[PDB]
C-alpha cells in the first residue's frame, strides 16, 4: 500500500480511464420532456458525461485506502460526489478558454479535451445562470487564485472523501482519510506559497460554491429525467468490482 499524498494523486490524474464498461448514469429517459430536435445532442452529451463518471469511479477507487473502506460506504461516497467532481473538472478545464468598461461574461465551457460548450447554447437550454456560476465562482475565481494541479487534485480527494455523507457504516474511517488530506494541503500551501495569507481557506471556500452549483444542476437534470436516479448505486456498485 502507498501513502495518500498529493504525490500519489497527481500520478492518478494522468491515469487514463478504461472505457470498457458502458454505464449510463445519464441518459435521455423515454419519459423526458426534452424537445425532439435536441435529443440527439442532449443524448450525445450524456454519453460524454457517462465516460467521465466511470472515469472518476475508477479514480476514486484507486485512491490510497479508499478501496479498503467498506464498499457500501465506498458506493455512497462516490454516489455522493460525482456531480461535484464532474463539475469541478469542467471548471478546471474551462480555465484555459477563460478570456480574463473592459470585461464581459465568458462564452466557453470546456466539457472534454477539444469539445466545448458555448454560452448561448446553455442560454437556449435555460441553464445560463448555472453555466455562468460555473465559470465565475469556479473557473474564473480559481484562475485568480492561481490554483495549481497539486491544490486541484487535493481538493478533489477532499470532495470525494466526505464523512458527512449520510449512511456511512463507519464515518470515522473516512474522517481519517479526509484529515490526512487537510494536512497534506496545508503544508503544500506553506511550502509552495507561504506568502499567501489565507490560501488554505480560499481553496476550501470553493467547496461550498461548488456544492451549490452541483445542487442546482441536479434540479435541472431531474426536471428532464436525465439522471438514472434509482440505478446509479448499482453501476457504482457493479463497476467497483
Amino acid at each position: 500500500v502507498q501513502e495518500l499524498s498529493i504525490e500519489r494523486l497527481l500520478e492518478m490524474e494522468s491515469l487514463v480511464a478504461d472505457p470498457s464498461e458502458e454505464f449510463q448514469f445519464l441518459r435521455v429517459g423515454p419519459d423526458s420532456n426534452v424537445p425532439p430536435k435536441f435529443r440527439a445532442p442532449v443524448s450525445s452529451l450524456c454519453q460524454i458525461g457517462n465516460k467521465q463518471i466511470a472515469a472518476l469511479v475508477v479514480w476514486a477507487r484507486d485512491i490510497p485506502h479508499f478501496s479498503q473502506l467498506e464498499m457500501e460506504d465506498q458506493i455512497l461516497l462516490i454516489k455522493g460526489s460525482w456531480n461535484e467532481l464532474l463539475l469541478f473538472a469542467i471548471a478546471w478545464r474551462s480555465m484555459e478558454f477563460l478570456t480574463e468598461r473592459t470585461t464581459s461574461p465568458p462564452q466557453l465551457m470546456c466539457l472534454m479535451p477539444g469539445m466545448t460548450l458555448h454560452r448561448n447554447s446553455a442560454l437556449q437550454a435555460g441553464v445560463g445562470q448555472i453555466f455562468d456560476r460555473v465559470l465565475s465562482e469556479l473557473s474564473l475565481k480559481m484562475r485568480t487564485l492561481r490554483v495549481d494541479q497539486a491544490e486541484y487534485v487535493a481538493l478533489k480527494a477532499i470532495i470525494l472523501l466526505n464523512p458527512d455523507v449520510k449512511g456511512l457504516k463507519n464515518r470515522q474511517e473516512v474522517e481519517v482519510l479526509r484529515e490526512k488530506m487537510f494536512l497534506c494541503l496545508d503544508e503544500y500551501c506553506r511550502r509552495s506559497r507561504s506568502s499567501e495569507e489565507g490560501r488554505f481557506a480560499a481553496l476550501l471556500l470553493r467547496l461550498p460554491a461548488l456544492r451549490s452549483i452541483s445542487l442546482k444542476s441536479f434540479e435541472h437534470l431531474f426536471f428532464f429525467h436525465l439522471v438514472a436516479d434509482t440505478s446509479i448505486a448499482g453501476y457504482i456498485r457493479d463497476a467497483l468490482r
Partner: protein, 236 residues
C-alpha cells in the same frame, strides 16, 4: 505562534456577546407566540418560531463590523442568502443527542415525529444528521460566532462589490485561523480543525436548498408560509 490584535479580541468578545444576546427571542416575543393552554399546531409553532429566528439572525448580522459598509442592495443580498444557512448553525446548538430532538426556545423538544405531523417530514432526517455531525464536532462559542460571521460575508450571486465582502470575510476567516492556532499547539491538527470547520460551509449549502424546497413543497400544498419568510427566501 502569535496571539491576536485588540480589534480581533474586541470582535471575538463582541461576537460572543451578541451571540448570547440573540440566541433566543425576547421573553415577550417568546411569550406572545407561545400563548396557549389538528396539523396546524406544530405547523404554527415551527413556522412562527422560525420568523423569530430569522429576525434575530438579521439583527445579529447588522451588529457585524463592516456590514454597514455594504450597499443596501448587497446587504439584502447577503442577508437573504445567509438567513437560512445560519438558522442551520442555530438549530445545531439546540440539538440534544440524548433524545435526538431539537429544543425550541420555549424549552420544548421537537422530535422527527413532530416535524412529520407538521408536514416538515422532508426537512428533518437530514437536519438531524447535520446535528449529530455538529455534535461530535464539539465546537466552542467562539468558533460558532466566528463561523456565523463568515457565512454572512460568504460570496453570494447578485453581489455589487463582491471583492469587498471577500475581505470583510477574510478578516473573520483570519481571526478564526489565529484563535484555533492558540487554543491548541500550533501543530499539525491545527489545520485539520480549521478545515472540518470550513467544511460546515458546504453542508450548510445543501440544507439551505432543502429549506427552500420545503418552502416550495409547502406553498404547493397550499399552506400559508408566513409572507415574511416567503419574501426573505425568494420562495416564488
Amino acid at each position: 505562534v502569535p496571539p491576536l490584535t485588540a480589534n480581533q479580541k474586541s470582535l471575538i468578545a463582541r461576537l460572543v456577546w451578541y451571540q448570547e444576546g440573540y440566541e433566543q427571542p425576547s421573553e415577550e416575543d417568546l411569550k406572545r407566540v407561545t400563548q396557549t393552554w389538528d396539523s396546524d399546531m406544530p405547523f404554527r409553532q415551527i413556522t412562527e418560531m422560525t420568523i423569530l429566528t430569522v429576525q434575530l439572525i438579521v439583527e445579529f448580522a447588522k451588529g457585524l463590523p463592516g456590514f454597514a459598509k455594504i450597499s443596501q442592495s448587497d446587504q439584502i443580498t447577503l442577508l437573504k442568502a445567509c438567513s437560512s444557512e445560519v438558522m442551520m448553525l442555530r438549530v445545531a446548538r439546540r440539538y440534544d443527542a440524548a433524545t435526538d430532538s431539537v429544543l425550541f426556545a420555549n424549552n420544548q423538544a421537537y422530535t422527527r415525529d413532530n416535524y412529520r405531523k407538521a408536514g416538515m417530514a422532508y426537512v428533518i432526517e437530514d437536519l438531524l444528521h447535520f446535528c449529530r455531525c455538529m455534535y461530535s464536532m464539539m465546537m466552542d462559542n467562539v468558533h460558532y460566532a466566528l463561523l456565523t460571521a463568515i457565512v454572512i460575508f460568504s460570496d453570494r450571486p447578485g453581489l455589487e462589490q463582491p471583492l469587498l465582502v471577500e475581505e470583510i470575510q477574510r478578516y473573520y476567516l483570519n481571526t478564526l485561523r489565529v484563535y484555533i492556532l492558540n487554543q491548541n499547539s500550533a501543530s499539525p491538527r491545527c489545520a485539520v480543525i480549521f478545515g472540518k470547520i470550513l467544511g460546515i460551509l458546504t453542508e450548510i449549502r445543501t440544507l439551505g436548498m432543502q429549506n427552500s424546497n420545503m418552502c416550495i413543497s409547502l406553498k404547493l400544498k397550499n399552506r400559508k408560509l408566513p409572507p415574511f419568510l416567503e419574501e426573505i427566501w425568494d420562495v416564488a
